[PDB]
A paper describes a structure:
[name] protein contains seven homology domains (JH1-7), of which JH1 (residues 836-1132) is the kinase domain, and JH2 (residues 543-824) is the pseudokinase domain. The JH2 domain has no catalytic activity but could negatively regulate the activity of JH1 and inhibit the kinase activity of [name]. The [name] mutation site is located above the N-terminus of the JH2 domain, and when the valine at position 617 is replaced by phenylalanine with a higher molecular weight, the prolongation of helix C and the interaction between F617 and the helix C phenylalanines 594 and 595 of JH2 domain is stable and activates the JH1 domain. [name] ([name]) hyperactivation by JAK2V617F mutation leads to myeloproliferative neoplasms (MPNs) and targeting [name] could serve as a promising therapeutic strategy for MPNs.
Here, we report that Flonoltinib Maleate (FM), a selective [name]/[name] inhibitor, shows high selectivity for [name] over the JAK family. The results showed that FM could bind [name] JH2 and [name] JH2V617F protein with the KD values of 3.14 and 5.21 µM, respectively, indicating that FM had a better affinity for [name] JH2 compared to [name] JH1 and [name] JH2V617F. We obtained the crystal structure of the complex of [name] JH2 and FM. Two nitrogen atoms of pyrimidine-2-amine in FM were found to form two hydrogen bonds with the carbonyl and NH backbone of V629 in the hinge region of [name]. The hydrophobic interaction between FM and the surrounding amino acid residues of [name] could also be found in the complex of [name] JH2 and FM. The L551, I559, L579, and L680 of [name] could further enhance the binding stability between FM and [name] JH2. The benzene of FM could form a hydrophobic interaction with the side chain of L551. The I559 of [name] also interacted with the pyrazole ring of FM with hydrophobic interaction. In addition, the other hydrophobic residues near the active binding site also contributed to the binding affinity, such as the V610, F628, and F631 for [name]. However, FM is different from previous [name] inhibitors because of its unique ability to selectively bind to the JH2 domain of [name], exerting its function through an allosteric mechanism.
Author numbering: 536 to 810
Write the structure that this text describes.
């Protein structure tokens, strides 16, 4: 279960944005660490909105499944603060924030090798999940966090972690699901409870498209009704200008769930690009 953290030991600081029915804040946790040394630890405080408290179970189950595993590419959960009025997840703070914002800001400093490294790390995380037969259900660049920037003078590649899925698509309003096209696969638009390992393979492809597109959002110009018809007409996303992963993207975003490649196969395909 989750380590229960006291309101008294948490300081809330600046807002870092929003998720679905959530707000995130940078914060500080007072704790006793190794050797009994006192620390003031930077943390991410994720707060379920007051007006959506009926989603509290899905909110914590999302973080819970994530926290019964340990892996270098998965965001750490420190605990929960059930205390009082609010429902709060206390997670590790990641310096450089979401990948989608980072891509947009640094679009012109990010080359093919950077993208390949991040894609490989994300595939490793998803491979780990697949081996444990655990569904994430919300893979997207917004839910990928950058721990460390690239350093091309000390050899260091960038390093990412995948954050928790948030409130499951199985219990979310239809309108939110439709807006999440094309991350949510077609079979889940027809029936959200078609949530399957195959689900994350589709969303992985959509996330690769993001990575290759400098933080653009695919189909952003389409409203929810046009997004629905995009799936009905069985369209594929356009290749990004940097089209090196275009085939991989389309192979993952296969309208037939059973034909989507394993993350083993995906990683093998990723390792094949270079010279
Ligand atoms: C789990 C987690 C851990 N650490 C962090 N850290 C973290 C650091 C920095 C930012 N910035 C926000 C503002 C940016 N600019 C300057 C103004 C407007 O864009 C600058 C970057 C950040 F959003 C997040 N976030 C998370 C986490 C958990 N869920 N989510 C989703 C809901 C987004 C993120």
């Amino acid at each position: 279960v989750f380590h229960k953290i006291r309101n008294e030991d948490l300081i809330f600081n600046e807002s870092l944005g929003q998720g679905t029915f959530t707000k995130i804040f940078k914060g500080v946790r007072r704790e006793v660490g190794d050797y009994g040394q006192l620390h003031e630890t930077e943390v991410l405080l994720k707060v379920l909105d007051k007006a959506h408290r009926n989603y509290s179970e899905s909110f914590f189950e999302a973080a819970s499944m994530m926290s019964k595993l340990s892996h270098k590419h998965l965001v750490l959960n420190y605990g929960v603060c059930f205390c009082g009025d609010e429902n709060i997840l206390v997670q590790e703070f990641v310096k450089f924030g979401s990948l989608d914002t980072y891509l947009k800001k640094n679009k012109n400093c990010i080359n093919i090798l950077w993208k390949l490294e991040v894609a490989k790390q994300l595939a490793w995380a998803m491979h780990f999940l697949e081996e444990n037969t655990l569904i994430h259900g919300n893979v997207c660049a917004k839910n990928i966090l950058l721990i460390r920037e690239e350093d091309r003078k000390t050899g260091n590649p960038p390093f990412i972690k995948l954050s928790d899925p948030g409130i499951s698509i199985t219990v979310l309003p239809k309108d939110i699901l439709q807006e999440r096209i094309p991350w949510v696969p077609p079979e889940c638009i027809e029936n959200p409870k078609n949530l399957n390992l195959a689900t994350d393979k589709w969303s992985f492809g959509t996330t690769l498209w993001e990575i290759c597109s400098g933080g653009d959002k695919p189909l952003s110009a389409l409203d929810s009704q046009r997004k629905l018809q995009f799936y009905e007409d069985r369209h594929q996303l356009p290749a990004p200008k940097a089209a090196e992963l275009a085939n991989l993207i389309n192979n993952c975003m296969d309208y037939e769930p059973d034909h989507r490649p394993s993350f083993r196969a995906i990683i093998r395909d990723l390792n094949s690009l270079f010279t």
